[PDB]
RNA sequence: GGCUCUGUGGCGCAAUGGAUAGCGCAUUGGACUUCUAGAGAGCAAUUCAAAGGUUGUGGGUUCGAAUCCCACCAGAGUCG
């Protein structure tokens, strides 16, 4: 069982093991929005915080693997103990890092020995700033966060009860029951991208478009989405729930006539 | 006012008075005479081949093109099996056939009054295209969307635009090397919905082009 | 009340892990090494490639920002005033970020969060170093700065930009045979439709506010070497920030923001569950071809 | 024209859809050189359809002419899928049809809609 | 006039005593994808590789200095 701290309708995951479990077991990968430690000034590969979609959080909570908790707030009953523990930890890190740096310097000097000697012969004959601290991407302390109720609209979960979220959640659940991987497709003109497998190695084929049944479809939008899918080698796949507890799709393609 | 640039209109690697007459059949406009078709598609590139892709070398003018020809130029006179129609009746008939014809025709008139030859952007998912000097010579550079609003900027959205739709259209027009332009049409809010019956309301109408272009944050990093 | 969920403690690094982090190569492992497949046929080669890519991704995301406490300019988080106060003197980033008032070096919330992400500072709150999770929770609210706004700020700063917070029959055809002489003459006669621009008549809408407002001023990366805080000049583009779910800005919003911006290009900074989609509306006069 | 009145002899829908069907028939026959196209109708939805053969000896292919100025709710899409399946002779193949949208300039674009998933 | 900070490939930056001084954007080449009225475009139809240097100049410490220390050159902020 995992935890996904929710705040203002934003599901974020701050653990690497949580994302490892989500992508492998539950077939959900989400997106990364942080900054990479090993290079912060590039936008090619981003950091840890996993921006799970509202549907990706509701569904994972509705299957018994994710417990949506609300983001805690500062508690004044632990600050003194936290300060004492933090000071002890920083002193321990100071000592250990100093020792390790000294040993590393000694080892490298021994390795370069006799070369230092050759240099010195050819010549004569002729720590505070070093301390390292971690800017942790997740809380280093455990917190007691009240769980979240997602069936009743609230301030930390404004999604429940809205049509645009319920329809998308139904379509996401039905497309995820079939073992597909799913991801947002704002760039591609649709609400989802359907990958036959992990999106790392495999492309996607279907650019979903979560349309309500009675909602009118502007034919120009349909044509644009179909042509975009063609130009990306993907088939537009309309989706919509039905009152009889079933969802019907319609693979829209371009006939090369 | 950071007026958008005018990226050069690319060329095609390859290349290559008289009162007209059109017949309104089945709520659509048609042109039959041969020389009339030749002049209509050669001297302006109006309409599309009845069965061919572009030219009738084996002509059906869209609503906007036919109305432009009759009104802005006065060369074309649409008919209904016995009846030379008048510009007001054309406005009403084409609004009945398509409720959102006023907006599209006003945008078409604005763009074609600037020398650009526009065409339907059905294939790319838009309302109008813009071929410079004609379709054969230059690749169309602009894919046009059209809306309507009043001087207070409140009106009936002709085509609702979610960010999904704008992203899709921009990506398509980028992949086909085109610019996605919105052509918001602004009308006085104090104009009653009775002057719209006459076409002269355009003189009080105000256009506002907005080139919606993607901004790749990495390419615009320096100059 | 419902039971209390105990979120587990995050990852804590040791001396060996910290030193290994400081000896890291900044070579990014390639995303999905090799071209992308199109049909999962169950081939063991596909499974091996997937295993390789996944293990690389998990070894990458398990890395913690490690920095030396000689370049980690300390800072303090002041929620009452609503900024961050620097204890030690600032560094290179002070040529483009932060402001000085009352005689102290003070940082804005989003700027402080970005510096925390880049390892430039060591943010504190009540004498406790704030992690990036707690910094996201506190510094990003509906009062100080949103989450989408910080997302865009951090993106543009990572690319190397300078983003500074905003601080203000009876009816006849139009043409007759007697006026067809030159293409320009006709194209002007039948041009009764008068064009406008986003700011034209833009003064009377700032009262009709609500919804979308400009946020940042963007200076390109090249303008970072010689940047004057007091006299920075005309920015490259003023930034509005929205979401992919939120409605497209109406023409009212476009005119209002364009007037409130001036001769600076407008940019919108859409966010779609993490993706960033900097679309930019820009007035345009179609040349009389 | 024989087929023009054939579409217009069923008294279904409006004139615009009849003309759209005539255009789509003309295209699919005299441009793609399909083996044979036969007119159809659908009073259940005030709709018109065309059934033709892509290649001699192959199966049939439904067509659903549409003007761009007409809305299409996904429920209508399912209805037309079922109608086309009934027109296809009720085979085991997944339901499908053609959506040859038509503008007032006779421009035609074909986007076949198939029930379920269809890879590119 | 004093004080603080900055200077590394075209740009943003890492490395802050020892290997080949490296990462991204950018540029140039590979492979593939689409192009219907699009040589282009390519953003989970994307995916790879190369080349790119006055480390501000000068001097010093040291067996090696982009790493430390001084002199200055240019730049930014603050005070007065
Ligand atoms: Mg530089």
Author numbering:
A (entry chain C): 1 to 126, 179 to 309
B (entry chain B): 1 to 16, 37 to 78, 297 to 461
C (entry chain D): 6 to 173, 403 to 523
D (entry chain A): 43 to 162
Quote the authors verbatim.
The removal of these introns is carried out by a conserved splicing machinery known as tRNA splicing endonuclease (EndA or TSEN). In archaea, four distinct types of EndAs that share similar architectural arrangements but employ different domains and subunit compositions are observed, including α4, α′2, (αβ)2, and ε2-type complexes, while the eukaryotic TSEN complex is a heterotetrametric complex consisting of four subunits: two structural units, TSEN15 and TSEN54, and two catalytic units, TSEN34 and TSEN2. TSEN54 and TSEN15 function as scaffolds to recruit the catalytic subunits TSEN34 and TSEN2.
In this work, we report the structure of an active human tRNA splicing endonuclease complex bound to an intron-containing pre-tRNA, revealing the recognition and cleavage mechanism of pre-tRNA by human TSEN endonuclease complex. To obtain more homogeneous samples and capture the in-action structure of the wild-type complex, we reduced the incubation time, omitted the subsequent gel filtration step, and kept the sample at 4 °C or on ice, which preserved the integrity of most pre-tRNA molecules during the process of freezing the grid. The overall structural arrangement of the human TSEN complex is in a rectangular parallelepiped pattern, similar to that of the α′2-type endonuclease from Archaeglobus fulgidus bound with a BHB RNA. The scissile phosphate is located at the center of the catalytic triad of residues in TSEN2, Y369, H377, and K416. This is supported by the presence of G38 and the NTE loop of TSEN2, a critical feature missing in all other structural studies.
